[PDB]
A paper describes a structure:
BAP29 and BAP31 are two homologous membrane proteins (∼50% sequence identity in humans) that reside in the endoplasmic reticulum (ER). They both consist of an N-terminal membrane-bound domain with three predicted transmembrane helices, and a C-terminal cytoplasmic region, which encompass ∼50% of the protein and is predicted to form a coiled coil, or more likely two coiled coils. BAP31 controls the fates of its bound clients, which may be either retained in the ER, progress through the secretory pathway or be extruded and subjected to ER-associated degradation. The structures presented here now show for the first time that the vDED domain adopts a dimeric coiled coil fold with no structural similarity to DED domains.
Numbering used by the authors:
A (entry chain A): 169 to 220
B (entry chain B): 170 to 219
Write the structure that this text describes.
Amino acid sequence: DVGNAEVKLEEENRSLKADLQKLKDELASTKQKLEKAENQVLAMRKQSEGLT
Amino acid sequence: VGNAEVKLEEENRSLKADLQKLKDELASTKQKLEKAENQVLAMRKQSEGL
C-alpha cells in the first residue's frame, strides 16, 4: 500500500533527521576538541624547546 | 502530492547517505583526537623527567 510505505518512510525520515542532528553536534564538538589537542601539542613543543 | 512517495524515497536515500558519511567522519575525527591526546600524555612524561 502507498499509505503504508509513506508512513514507514516518514517515520524513518524523522528518526534519521534526529540521528543526523546528533551526529552533526558530536562532529562539531569532536573537531573543536581535536583542534584544541593539536594546539596543545604545538604549545608544548614550543615550551619544551624554550626550556631545552 | 503526485510526487509524494518518490520525494519521500529521495529524502530517505539522502538522509541515509548523509548518516553514513557523518558516522565515518565522526569515527575518523575521534581516532585523531585519541592520538593527539595520547601525544599530549607522552609529552607530559618526557617533560616530567627533564
